[PDB]
Design a protein around this ligand. Structure first.
Ligand SMILES: CCCCCCCCCCCCC/C=C\[C@H](O)[C@H](N)CO
Ligand SMILES: [Cl-]
Ligand SMILES: [Cl-]
Ligand SMILES: [Cl-]
Ligand SMILES: [K+]
Lengths: 52, 64, 242, 282, 52
C-alpha cells in the first residue's frame, strides 16, 4: 500500500498509485534558509501558495 | 516517480537566472518495446513543485 | 367593544403568510403515522447526492439522449490534448441541469458553498492513463492549453490506479452568495470553468477497445446552502393538463 | 427449551448553519473515490487543496421542506358561467384532484410519500376580475356523502358536511384541513391496481389510481332559489403545513399531459439540459 | 515636531518634514481579512514585502 498515495501542495493535488515510494534526496527536507547561514540582510518574501 | 530535493549550493541564495542548481534526467536504460497493435504513443510528463521558495533583492524585472 | 384601528395589509392574501385559519372538522383525528424509511427534512440532504452530469450535451445527441450521460476518452496521437470543458455554474443552463442539485437550486435565487464532481472511468481494466482536471476561477476564458489550465486548482488522476476521482470546486467568490449566473450582468456570479486534459495518454494493449467512456457525477459539499426561495423556470404548463 | 433453534445505523443531527472550513498544508488516499459502491464522495476542501479557516454562519433554515412547501399555490380553477355549455345551473361539483397545475405538482412529486395538513384559500371574482355583491356557498362532500344534483338540492342543508358561506366582496374565505387519508400518508405514486381481478385493457385506467388519495368532492353554488346573473371564477390556493416527506425521486423533466399519470409526449422527448456544438467549447 | 517624520515599509522609506500630520481614514487601520468576514475557502497568499 506504498504505491497508493496522494500529495497536496498549493491548489494542486497529485494522486499516484503505481508509485515506487518516494525519495528524499540526500535524506533532507527542503527548508527556508536559517539565520546562521543567511547573509543578505533584507527581509525575504515567502509567497507560499502562489509559488509552492 | 517522485523525488524531493533540498536546496544545494555553496551559497544560501543565488540568481535563478545565471545558475542552475541541478538538472533532471530521464533516460531509457531499457528501451521501450511492445507488439505492434498496442498503443504506440507513450508519453512522459513532468510535473514539478518548488518548495519553501524564498526571494530577495527586489528591483525591476530581468529576464536574463 | 375594544378600540382598534385597521392598518394597511388588512384584507390582503399573502400566499406565504403563515397564519391560523379555522378547522373544518372539529375533533377529527388523522390516521396515525407509521415508520417509513427514507424520510428527509431538508432539501440539502438531497443536494449532497451525486447525480449524473450531461457533459456530453451536444445538439447531435438530442435524438439519442442516452449518449449525453457520458463522454469519451481514446488513444491520443497528440500530447496534452483537451478532452472536455464546461462551466461550474450549477444553476446555469448546461450540463448541471441534469443533476438533482442543479434542478433543486433552481428553486432558490442564491447559493453558496463548495461543489464536488466525481469522474468514473468505465473503460476496460487493461486501459491505463493519467488525466489533468482543473477548475479555473473567474476571469480567464477557457484555458487555451494544458499548460495554462494547470495554473489553477487541479487534480491529476490515474485510471489503473483508481476507477473514480473527485475534483473539488472550492467556494471561491467575492460575495458570500452567488445568484444564478447567466449571460449579461449576472455573469458576475459565474463560478468558473472545469477542464479535462490528457496528462499522459489513454494506453491500451492489443485486444482492448481504443475508446472508452467517463461518467461525471456531481453534488454539493457540507458547506453548501441556498436562500431566497423562488419558482423554477424548468417546468411549464405549455398546455392544459387533463 | 428442548429445541435450540427457537431461542438502522444512521441517525439525525441538528445543523443550523453550513459546515465550516479548517486550515491545511503540504502533506492515506482520500481524493480517489470508489463511486462504484453507490456512495457520494466524502472528500471535502481540506483534502484536495490548502485552505484558510472560514467561520460560515450561512443558515440552512430556508431549505427545510416546511419552508419549501408552505407557500400557497394554485390547485384549481372552477368556473360557473351564465351563458353557455358549462353550468348554467348555478352550481358545480368538482372532484378533488390537485394534480392539474404543474408548479405545485412538480414540487410534490419530488417525494413519493407526503403527510400534511393544509390551508385552503378561496379567491373568487367575475371572469374579468370585477367583484359584485353575490352570496356563495362552498361545501365539502366527503366520499359517500350525497352530491348536490341542483342549486336547490337538499344536500345544501349541510347538516353534517362542513360548508362555508361568504360574499364575493368579503376577503377570500380560508380554512384549515387535517390529514385525511385512511393511510399513513398521501402518495403521489402508486405502482399497482386498486382492486383484484384480471386487468384487461378496458380497465387499465385503473393503473396508478390510489383510493387513499381520493378525498371526495368540493361543491359550490350561488345561494338562491333563482339563477344568478353573474359569471363566476373561483381560484383555489393550497398551502401545505405540518409536513413530513419520504423517498425523494427524480424531478419531472417532460411536460405534464394528464392529472392521473406520468404519460409523456413520445415524439418530442425533451433533454434535461440545453445543448451546444462541441464538448470542448462553451 | 509633527511635521518632522519618516515612514518605512518594504524596501522603501519616505522622509517628510513639511507634513501636516497623518490621516487615518475613518479612524481605521488596514488589516488582513478576519475569518468571520471571510468567505472564499482557499488559503490566500500574502506576499508582504514584495507588494506592501
Ligand atoms: C369547505 C372547505 C372544503 C375544502 C376541502 C378540501 C379537501 C382536500 C384535501 C387534500 C387532499 C390532497 C390531494 C390528494 C390526492 C391527489 O389529489 C390525487 N392524486 C388525486 O387522485
Ligand atoms: Cl449559478
Ligand atoms: Cl338552501
Ligand atoms: Cl410545516
Ligand atoms: K359598543
Amino acid at each position: 500500500s506504498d504505491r497508493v498515495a496522494q500529495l497536496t501542495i498549493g491548489n494542486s493535488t497529485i494522486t499516484t498509485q503505481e508509485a515506487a515510494n518516494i525519495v528524499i534526496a540526500y535524506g533532507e527536507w527542503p527548508e527556508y534558509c536559517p539565520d546562521t547561514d543567511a547573509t543578505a540582510v533584507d527581509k525575504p518574501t515567502r509567497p507560499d501558495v502562489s509559488v509552492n | 516517480a517522485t523525488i524531493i530535493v533540498p536546496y544545494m549550493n555553496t551559497v544560501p541564495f543565488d540568481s535563478a537566472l545565471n545558475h542552475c542548481n541541478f538538472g533532471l534526467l530521464v533516460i531509457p536504460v531499457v528501451p521501450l518495446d511492445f507488439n505492434t497493435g498496442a498503443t504506440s504513443e507513450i508519453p512522459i510528463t513532468v510535473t514539478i513543485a518548488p518548495m519553501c521558495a524564498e526571494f530577495a533583492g527586489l528591483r525591476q524585472a530581468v529576464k536574463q | 367593544g375594544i378600540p382598534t384601528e385597521l392598518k394597511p395589509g388588512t384584507n390582503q392574501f399573502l400566499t406565504t403568510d403563515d397564519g391560523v385559519s379555522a378547522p373544518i372538522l372539529p375533533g377529527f383525528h388523522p390516521t396515525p403515522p407509521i415508520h417509513i424509511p427514507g424520510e428527509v427534512h431538508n432539501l440539502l440532504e438531497i443536494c449532497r447526492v451525486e447525480t449524473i452530469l450531461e457533459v456530453n450535451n451536444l445538439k447531435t445527441n438530442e435524438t439519442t439522449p442516452m449518449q449525453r450521460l457520458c463522454f469519451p476518452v481514446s488513444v491520443q496521437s497528440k500530447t496534452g490534448e483537451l478532452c472536455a470543458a464546461f462551466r461550474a455554474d450549477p444553476g446555469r443552463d448546461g450540463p448541471w441541469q441534469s443533476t438533482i442539485l442543479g434542478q433543486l437550486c433552481r428553486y432558490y435565487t442564491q447559493w453558496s458553498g463548495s461543489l464536488e464532481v466525481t469522474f468514473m472511468f468505465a473503460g476496460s481494466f487493461m486501459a491505463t492513463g493519467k488525466m489533468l482536471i482543473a477548475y479555473t476561477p473567474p476571469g480567464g476564458n477557457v484555458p487555451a492549453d494544458r499548460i495554462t489550465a494547470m495554473l489553477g486548482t487541479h487534480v491529476i488522476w490515474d485510471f489503473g490506479l483508481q476507477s473514480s476521482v473527485t475534483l473539488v470546486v472550492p467556494w471561491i467568490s467575492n460575495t458570500h452568495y452567488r445568484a444564478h449566473a447567466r449571460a449579461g450582468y449576472f455573469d458576475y456570479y459565474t463560478t468558473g470553468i472545469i477542464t479535462i486534459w490528457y496528462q499522459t495518454n489513454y494506453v491500451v494493449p492489443i485486444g482492448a477497445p481504443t475508446t472508452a467512456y467517463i461518467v461525471a457525477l456531481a453534488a454539493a459539499q457540507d458547506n453548501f446552502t441556498m436562500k431566497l426561495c423562488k419558482d423554477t423556470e424548468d417546468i411549464e404548463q405549455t398546455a392544459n393538463i387533463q | 427449551d428442548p429445541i435450540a433453534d427457537m431461542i438502522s445505523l444512521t441517525a439525525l443531527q441538528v445543523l443550523p448553519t453550513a459546515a465550516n472550513t479548517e486550515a491545511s498544508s503540504h502533506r492515506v488516499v482520500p481524493a480517489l473515490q470508489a463511486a462504484e459502491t453507490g456512495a457520494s464522495s466524502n472528500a471535502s476542501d481540506k483534502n484536495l487543496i490548502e485552505t484558510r479557516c472560514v467561520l460560515n454562519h450561512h443558515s440552512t433554515q430556508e431549505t427545510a421542506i416546511g419552508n419549501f412547501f408552505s407557500r400557497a399555490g394554485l390547485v384549481s380553477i372552477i368556473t360557473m358561467p351564465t351563458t353557455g355549455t358549462q353550468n348554467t345551473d348555478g352550481y358545480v361539483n368538482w372532484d378533488i384532484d390537485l394534480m392539474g397545475y404543474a408548479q405545485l405538482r412538480r414540487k410534490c412529486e419530488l417525494f413519493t410519500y407526503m403527510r400534511f395538513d393544509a390551508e385552503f384559500t378561496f379567491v373568487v371574482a367575475k371572469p374579468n376580475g370585477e367583484l359584485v355583491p353575490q352570496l356563495l356557498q362552498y361545501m365539502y362532500v366527503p366520499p359517500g356523502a350525497p352530491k348536490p344534483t341542483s342549486r336547490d338540492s337538499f344536500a345544501w342543508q349541510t347538516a353534517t358536511n362542513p360548508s362555508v358561506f361568504v360574499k364575493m366582496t368579503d376577503p377570500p374565505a380560508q380554512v384549515s384541513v387535517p390529514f385525511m387519508s385512511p393511510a399513513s400518508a398521501y402518495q403521489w405514486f402508486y405502482d399497482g391496481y386498486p382492486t383484484f381481478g384480471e386487468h384487461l385493457q378496458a380497465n387499465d385506467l385503473d393503473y396508478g389510481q390510489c383510493p387513499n388519495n381520493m378525498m371526495g368532492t368540493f361543491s359550490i353554488r350561488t345561494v338562491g332559489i333563482e339563477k344568478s346573473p353573474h359569471s363566476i371564477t373561483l381560484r383555489v390556493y393550497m398551502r401545505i403545513k405540518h409536513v413530513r416527506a419520504w423517498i425523494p425521486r427524480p424531478l419531472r423533466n417532460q411536460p405534464y399531459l394528464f392529472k392521473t399519470n406520468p404519460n409523456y409526449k413520445g415524439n418530442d422527448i425533451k433533454c434535461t439540459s440545453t445543448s451546444r456544438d462541441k464538448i470542448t467549447t462553451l
